[PDB]
């Protein structure tokens, strides 16, 4: 039985726990591709069943994701609830390695939910951009505000009758009142944003213009003298509507956006999105396809730990590896240029395989390359990141253990720094990442903004590791799969064979048809976990793209860490994150 | 009946082939050569499936689904691995001698071959020797022949043959160089060859009007539409791109002209496209031509009408029943004018006052086909309501449908249909002044004036009846023959009687109403069909008005000083120099159009109108259904400078003007309210297509696909910033993808047929409830009127025998598909196709001229003596001689008019 | 369909003749000799049944002349791997229910019945390696494996 299967889950035992525990017409088991067992659960019944989750004997211990989904224009809903809308909550259980998604059927006119932030407090930021973008309101929310438009916003974008395109709308004009209107809407009010304020408590505004690569947002401080006693994060200056463009292109042509989800991964943010696709489309890659995809995915990921680890000795103050660093970045991008023809948004992973083969000369520049990165890594630890001073400003600073990580969604170095050994590509493999001998960095316990650099200059050098593997080990064979649905088809057969043709041009024009299904992937990017859910109502356009990123749980666990400590504690719990804004509004 | 496929339960229509009814419950089989319409004859081998003897059965047998009867309990299976396999094959099969020609290909995107090569999953290519090729034919100006594309799944050859009833195309040749084509390079004689676009599933026959500017289906902008060029009212899909009317679909509508419109609606309409077209409102000063946006025209035509002391108001059958309602409430009731003439509007009442008070039903285009006998009085069918022939063709093959019905046989197993009905046929009686295009299968044609078609008409409904008037001076041969169509239509279940104004005579529609009101009285199931002239002459007529020799007559006494002319050239309708005399007297003329007509010489102001691709509003067509039409693309949005608007929107914005001297322009909805308040006969036209605020869910719908392309760079030379996307504030469509064109959605109006995997018009089948049927959700388009439940009374006004007068001639009618429409003459593809002018004549009657065949004669009406070539018209009786009309110079008011000094020049 | 010197002893009759994977048809046997290359005699036959076909339906019409070419290559010794497989495929999908008529089913007995006796025969035919596509400058080729 192939991977892409469509499968019930009924064998999983979280399936009779629930069976055994709220009866067995209590909700509807649904087949999926996603890979993971979908429960449509009742909506009074929803915090019942997360509670009984989060007391299993190995309990569902993270709320991975929580959006929603319009359900008005989906046809193909056979073996469904009836639902307007629906509400679906991704959790997993790292001791299990299990994850579940509950979904809660909602009418149109009765569009509220019981909000979960009682049992995950990811659901904050989680539901804010739920009732955001789709109206969906949450009942006992502790402000019920919108997060990614502002707040002088008419209608929910993520909404099927919602049109798209800003061509669609008025040309923005720019006059006076207008200005100040919206120069209103961004001041900051302290009893809006439930600050709850002592004739001592200062307000400190961050952003929005923000002096660094990752982005432009805003932090609004409440300060005690120099102790932070509270603060929110605002987020939504970096949307770009990636998701209603994911239900606006088609399969093949959605990809480039696809790259600008997390614009320091490129082909880290491709490989999620073309192996969901791939379920849809019933395509088992060959093992070439796998290796490339694989040392792809390995240079980019040493490229954006590369910047990171520049940014945050940057942060620190010491400026000069940041120009080493990027000199590093230049080689891999001299790689990057040489195999798909680009620096940071390559677009070069397809659906069944890749857009090129592999150009004469590859190994000789990935030779260069793993000659050039070791010595020059050495010298960055030892010039900047064994310093005191470094140590002494990162050490210690927004420091959180396992719990604090688990309750809050936050995965990758931050994660790993806890002592949970939870990576992507050894858990629940992928792309052929079985065949590749490396190991995964962990931590003693403790989070702090040292761990984090020093796991993510481990993560370098395993990185490292895979691409000599990769250079040793890659076979010969396709660069695309022989699926039918393989898009686009190889370029020569299109141009000699009619058939090949015919399938190339519906294709490209029209969009190939995937079959009415769902389907996820998760992958380990290089900020964390990153995860695709697309739902396809058989069509050549996404019904529904559902992007997962892991620095919007860490910009949501901020107020929870920096909590108690100085600004440029928060500074520098900034530069050691490796968030990047389009990751966190996409 | 129940089916099972794949496991799963259906319940279907036992009298259905497997295919259709698997296509109608939403499932996918290939197929080539089944059409809905055609019928099944095993051909494409393309659409097996594996059927099992039980349901306890593994092995199973491959059968056609196109040719397997959907009986109850059975057992198929379509994704089964050996017919997966099987269609693949067929698909390399029809690949290997397929040319490398997507690209280059009119087909392409639109393509059903394409859809079935991707469905069936075939990508990868093996065959490695050599591909067949053909050479071209010239098959005219509006269809292009490009025979390597073919896969031989004759779909032409029987659409062409079997149902359009043409000779001119068919299948020649041996086992694999078969060729589907003419014998010889020539224009295609079928007024409906026009199909053979949409019937091949490949780019074997494309439209060349189309070809020379041509886009791909993703690109174009498509609205749903009335076609304009006659009264028959098929619906349509035009499809627009960069700012020209692209192309016309035809867009199905399972009560009128479900799969196929005719030539003149298909490639008539290039005088959208036309250069010369007013974009912009135009003021006359002197020898100056000031050009004017909407607002200062409005306000100086609003102070030159109340300058004025009588404003008369002259509508137009071209023209929307808003606008013409717009006109009336601008100039008054009793000011305005139809813009026909006296004898026009008398025959066009005479043909509502039957529809509507005769007690009799009258069918639908669809409908058409389900009678038993048929006969039409004085009416050009063909050359004027083609769409009725085709359908009165389908009626006449029912006698072969009820024959194989008889023995047994599947309704869509058209081979033994056809093969159990070799030729016998439905009684059909045409009758005409010459040979009619339906002669090949009428049962009789009586060849003869107008005076004695009505003269027939009179005494069949005498010897059905003997009620009605009788006729005196029958010749024996002509009463053999009236006892003919007597004895046929007393033995029809549902006779069908098909008359029009076409013909110029009053008579001809009394005796048709007088043969309908008998076959009525015997209890028989008889239907009426009245053919009109153009496309809103019903709608003109139901708000009605008078004539325009009134109007004429107004404007030469002085008592009007200002003439309002909407969307009417005032030739067509009465004579020329009487028409431009009675402009030059008027100081104010006023002309509302569209196209660049001759008397806009004479208007003091040019009001830059829409046309249908640019305009919305209703029409009703020749049995009474009002119906919507949709604007399809801006014409501000590229021209930035072009000011047209509606004609009702003109026409309101004036009155509001004249009025409280502000600018209003109209919303269309207010328009409808309005005619539905004012006139309670057009009361149904509210209920033709739903308002502005319809919603699919909260979207409204969508004009051009999902895969629209060049946002970003359509307009990019003229400016690099992307301009304001077009709102439509007066119908639920909007002027973009962003909306919603689902086959499931809950709508009437459909723009354009597209399903993921279906591309090609095979997506039809996706929009219907059942494959062949009515759309989904019911058909657009609602009946004005009721059959009413009593009759009209025996019109006692029998006409005196033709009697031939010496130095007189009678002017007997021809229509020409291609020439009689005022508009479809305006487009430049239909001169190659138009036919030159000639006069017909009698042999006896050229033999005592001394004139022979293609001499010229000169003949004076009205004082104007012009020159025109010779036929010899044999079936032409004798006394008569024969006008094109609607032609360049001929007015169809000269249908039974006459003739002086008609001598060789 | 062809029969070797062990079927020679059978009663010509339809159930006998039929148990055996051939048929009775017109009775009139034809013999084939040693010196009759069983790759020129079945092309004989299938550019025989495809130059007689009625052009009605696609498998006869357009599999055919497939297959005469692909027994024309093996005449000359210019077949290339997968061409009996594709002569088997075209046996499979040109038997009864699959055309309109019976002509495919019998131009195909022939083939069958030489491809199951004489294969070896056959063998000898491919020669050439298998090739589709030409090289195309500036574009790496799918190297299916
Ligand atoms: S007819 Fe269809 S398959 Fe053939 S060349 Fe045209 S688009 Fe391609
Ligand atoms: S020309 Fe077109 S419709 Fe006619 S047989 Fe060929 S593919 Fe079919
Ligand atoms: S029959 Fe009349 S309405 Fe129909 S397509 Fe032809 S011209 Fe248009
Ligand atoms: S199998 Fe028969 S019907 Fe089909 S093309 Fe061949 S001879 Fe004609
Ligand atoms: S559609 Fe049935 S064989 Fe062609
Ligand atoms: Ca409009």
Redesign the interface.
């Given at each position: 039985e192939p991977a892409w299967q469509t499968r019930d889950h009924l064998d999983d035992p979280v399936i009779g726990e629930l069976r055994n525990r709220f009866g067995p017409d209590a909700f509807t088991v649904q087949a999926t591709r996603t890979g993971v067992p979908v429960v449509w659960i009742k909506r009074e019944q929803l915090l019942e069943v997360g509670d009984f989750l989060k007391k299993l004997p190995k309990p569902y211990v993270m709320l991975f994701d929580l959006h929603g989904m319009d359900e008005?224009?989906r046809?193909h809903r056979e073996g469904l609830p009836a639902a307007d809308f629906s509400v679906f909550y991704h959790l997993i259980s790292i001791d299990r390695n299990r994850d579940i998604m509950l979904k809660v059927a909602l009418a149109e006119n009765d569009l509220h939910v019981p909000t979960f932030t009682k049992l995950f407090p990811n659901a904050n930021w989680y539901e804010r951009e739920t009732w955001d973008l789709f109206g969906i309101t949450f009942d006992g929310h502790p402000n019920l505000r919108r997060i990614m438009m502002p707040q002088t916003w008419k209608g929910h974008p993520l909404?099927?009758?919602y049109?798209?395109?800003a061509?669609?709308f008025?040309?923005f004009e720019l006059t006076k009142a207008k200005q100040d209107l919206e120069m209103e809407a961004l001041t900051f009010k302290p009893e809006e944003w439930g600050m709850k304020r002592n004739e001592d408590f200062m307000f400190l505004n961050l952003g929005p213009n923000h002096p660094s690569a990752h982005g432009a947002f805003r932090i609004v401080l409440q300060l005690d003298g120099e102790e932070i006693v509270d603060c929110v994060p605002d987020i939504g200056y970096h949307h770009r509507g990636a998701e209603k463009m994911g239900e606006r292109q088609?399969w093949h042509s959605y990809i480039p956006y696809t790259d600008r989800i997390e614009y320091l991964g490129g082909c880290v943010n491709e490989m999620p999105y073309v192996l969901a696709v791939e379920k849809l489309a019933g395509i088992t890659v060959?093992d070439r396809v796998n290796v490339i995809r694989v040392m792809l995915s390995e240079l980019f990921r040493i490229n954006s730990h590369l910047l990171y680890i520049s940014t945050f000795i940057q942060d620190v103050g010491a400026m000069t590896p940041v120009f080493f660093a990027f000199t590093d970045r230049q080689k891999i991008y001299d790689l990057v240029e040489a195999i798909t023809g680009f620096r940071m948004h390559p677009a070069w992973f397809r659906i069944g395989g890749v857009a090129?083969?592999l150009?004469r000369g590859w190994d000789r520049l990935l030779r260069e390359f793993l000659d050039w990165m070791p010595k020059r890594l050495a010298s960055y630890e030892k010039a900047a990141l064994q310093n005191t001073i470094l140590k002494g400003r990162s050490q210690g600073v927004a420091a959180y253990g396992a719990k604090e990580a688990l309750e809050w969604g936050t995965t990758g170095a931050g994660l790993r720094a806890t002592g949970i050994d939870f990576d992507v590509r050894k858990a629940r493999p992928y792309s052929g990442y079985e065949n590749f001998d490396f190991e995964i960095p962990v931590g003693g316990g403790v989070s702090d903004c040292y761990t984090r650099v020093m796991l993510k200059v481990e993560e370098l050098r395993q990185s490292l590791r895979i691409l000599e593997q990769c250079l040793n080990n890659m076979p010969?064979?396709?660069?695309?799969a022989?699926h039918?649905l393989?898009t686009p088809?190889?370029?020569?057969?299109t141009?000699?064979?009619?058939?090949?043709?015919?399938?190339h041009?519906?294709?490209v024009?029209?969009?190939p048809?995937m079959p009415a299904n769902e389907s996820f992937q998760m992958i380990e990017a290089t900020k964390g976990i990153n995860s695709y859910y697309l739902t396809s109502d058989?069509?050549?356009?996404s019904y529904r793209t559902r992007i997962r990123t892991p620095s919007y749980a860490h910009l949501q666990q901020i107020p929870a860490a920096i909590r108690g400590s100085l600004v440029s504690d928060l500074i520098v719990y900034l530069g050691s994150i490796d968030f990047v804004m389009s990751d966190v509004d996409r | 009946a129940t089916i099972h496929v794949d496991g799963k339960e259906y319940e279907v229509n036992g009298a259905d082939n497997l295919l259709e009814a698997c296509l109608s419950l939403g499932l996918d089989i290939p197929y080539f050569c089944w059409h809905p319409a055609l019928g099944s004859v095993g051909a494409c081998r393309q659409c097996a499936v594996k059927q099992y003897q039980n349901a306890e059965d593994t092995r199973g047998r491959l059968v056609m689904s196109c040719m397997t009867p959907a009986s109850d309990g059975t057992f198929i299976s379509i994704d089964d691995e050996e017919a997966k396999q099987f269609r693949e094959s067929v698909?390399?099969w029809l690949?290997t001698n397929?040319?490398?020609?997507?690209?280059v290909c009119e087909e392409?995107?639109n393509c059903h071959?394409?859809?079935m090569?991707?469905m069936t999953?075939?990508?990868?290519?093996r065959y490695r020797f050599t591909k067949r090729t053909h050479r071209n034919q010239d098959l005219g100006p509006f269809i292009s022949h490009e025979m390597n594309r073919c896969i031989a799944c004759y779909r032409c050859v029987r659409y062409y043959k079997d149902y359009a009833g043409g000779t001119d195309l068919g299948v020649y040749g041996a086992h694999d160089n078969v060729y589907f084509g003419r014998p010889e390079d020539g224009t295609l004689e079928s007024e409906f060859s026009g199909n053979l676009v949409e019937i091949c599933p490949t780019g074997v026959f494309t439209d060349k009007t189309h070809s020379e500017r041509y886009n791909?289906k993703?690109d174009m902008q498509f609205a749903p539409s009335i076609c304009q060029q006659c009264s028959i009212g098929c619906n349509i899909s035009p499809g627009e791109r960069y700012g020209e009317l692209r192309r016309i679909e035809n867009r199905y509508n399972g009560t009128v002209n479900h799969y196929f419109l005719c030539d003149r609606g298909r490639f008539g309409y290039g005088y959208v496209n036309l250069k010369d077209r007013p974009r912009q409102p135009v003021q006359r000063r002197g020898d100056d031509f000031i050009t004017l946006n909407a607002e200062q025209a409005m306000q100086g035509a609003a102070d030159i009408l109340r300058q004025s002391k009588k404003v008369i108001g002259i509508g137009s059958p071209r023209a929307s029943v808003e606008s013409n309602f717009a006109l009336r409430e601008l100039v008054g009731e009793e000011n305005f004018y139809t813009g026909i003439a006296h004898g026009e509007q008398e025959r066009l009442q005479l043909a509502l006052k039957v529809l509507r008070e005769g007690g009799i039903y009258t069918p639908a285009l669809r409908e058409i086909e389900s009678y038993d006998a048929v006969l039409v009085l004085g009416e050009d069918v063909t050359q004027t309501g083609a769409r009725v022939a085709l359908a009165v063709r389908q009626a006449v093959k029912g006698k072969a449908r009820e024959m194989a019905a008889a023995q047994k046989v599947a309704d869509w197993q058209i081979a033994a249909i056809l093969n159990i009905g070799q030729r016998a046929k439905h009684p059909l009686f045409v009758t005409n002044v010459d040979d009619t295009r339906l002669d090949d299968i009428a049962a009789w044609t009586y060849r003869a004036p107008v005076e004695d078609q009505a003269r027939l008409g009179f005494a069949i409904a005498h010897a059905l009846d003997n009620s009605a008037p009788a006729v005196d001076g029958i010749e024996p041969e002509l009463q053999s023959k009236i006892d003919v169509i007597v004895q046929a239509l007393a033995g029809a279940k549902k006779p069908l009687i098909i008359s029009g104004t076409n013909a110029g005579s009053l008579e001809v529609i009394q005796a048709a109403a007088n043969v309908a009101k008998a076959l009525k009285g015997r209890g028989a199931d008889v239907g009426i069909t009245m053919i009109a002239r153009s496309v809103n002459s019903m709608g003109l007529g139901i708000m009605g008005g008078g004539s325009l020799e009134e109007a004429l007559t107004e404007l030469e006494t002085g008592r009007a000083d200002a003439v309002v002319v909407l969307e009417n050239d005032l030739h067509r309708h009465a004579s020329a120099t009487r028409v431009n005399a009675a402009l030059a007297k008027a100081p104010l003329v006023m002309v509302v159009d569209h196209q660049r007509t001759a008397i806009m010489e004479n208007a003091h102001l040019v009001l830059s109108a829409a046309s249908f691709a640019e305009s919305d509003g209703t029409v009703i067509n020749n049995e009474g259904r009002a119906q919507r039409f949709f604007q399809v693309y801006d014409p501000a949005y590229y021209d930035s400078k072009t000011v047209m608007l509606e004609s009702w929107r003109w026409l309101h914005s004036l009155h509001s003007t004249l009025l409280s001297r502000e600018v209003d322009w109209t919303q269309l909805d207010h328009v409808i309210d309005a005619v539905v308040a004012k006139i309670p006969e057009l009361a149904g036209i509210k209920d033709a297509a739903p308002d502005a605020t319809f919603?699919i869910?909260?979207?409204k719908l969508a004009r051009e696909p999902?895969?629209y392309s060049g946002?970003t760079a359509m307009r990019a030379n003229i400016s690099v910033?992307?301009?304001?996307?077009p709102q439509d504030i007066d119908t639920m469509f909007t002027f973009?993808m962003?909306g919603?064109n689902?086959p499931?959605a809950h709508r009437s109006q459909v723009p354009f047929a597209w399903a993921?995997?279906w591309?090609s018009p095979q997506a039809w089948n996706k929009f219907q409830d059942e494959v062949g049927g009515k759309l989904r959700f019911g058909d657009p388009g609602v009946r004005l009127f009721e059959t009413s439940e009593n009759g009209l009374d025996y019109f006692t006004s029998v006409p005196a025998r033709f009697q031939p007068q010496d130095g007189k001639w009678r002017i007997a009618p021809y229509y020409h598909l291609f020439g009689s429409d005022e508009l479809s003459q305006r487009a430049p593809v239909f001169q190659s196709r138009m036919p030159q002018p000639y006069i017909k004549l009698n042999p006896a009657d050229a033999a005592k001229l001394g004139v022979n065949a293609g001499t010229r004669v000169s003949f004076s009406y009205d004082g104007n003596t012009v020159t025109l070539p010779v036929e010899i018209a044999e079936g032409l009786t004798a006394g008569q001689v024969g006008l094109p009309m609607g032609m360049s110079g001929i007015a169809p008011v000269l249908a039974g008019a006459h003739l002086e000094d008609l001598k060789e020049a | 369909d062809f029969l070797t010197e062990a079927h020679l002893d059978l009663p010509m009759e339809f159930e006998s003749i039929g148990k055996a994977g051939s048929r009775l048809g017109t009775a009139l046997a034809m013999a084939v000799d040693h010196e009759i290359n069983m790759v020129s005699l079945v092309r004989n036959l299938e550019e025989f049944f495809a130059r007689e076909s009625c052009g009605w339906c696609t498998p006869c019409r357009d599999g055919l002349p497939w297959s005469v070419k692909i027994l024309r290559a093996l005449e000359r010794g210019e077949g290339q791997p997968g061409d009996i497989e594709t002569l088997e495929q075209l046996c499979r999908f040109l038997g009864p229910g699959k055309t309109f008529c019976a002509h495919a089913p019998g131009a195909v007995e022939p083939l069958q019945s030489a491809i199951k006796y004489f294969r070896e025969e056959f063998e000898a035919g491919i020669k050439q390696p298998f090739s589709?596509?030409?090289?195309?400058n500036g574009?790496?080729?799918?190297?299916?494996?």
């Open positions: 008005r224009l046809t909404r099927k009758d049109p798209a395109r061509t669609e008025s040309p088609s060959p090129h083969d150009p010969e064979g396709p660069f695309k022989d039918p393989t088809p190889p370029k020569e057969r141009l000699q064979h009619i058939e090949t043709l015919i399938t041009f519906l294709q024009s029209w969009g048809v058989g069509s050549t356009m | 698909v390399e690949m397929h040319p490398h020609d997507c690209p392409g995107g071959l394409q859809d090569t991707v999953g075939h990508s990868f290519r791909r993703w919603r869910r909260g979207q999902h895969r946002r910033h992307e301009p304001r996307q973009s962003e919603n689902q499931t993921p995997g591309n | 589709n596509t030409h090289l195309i574009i790496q080729p799918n190297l299916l494996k």
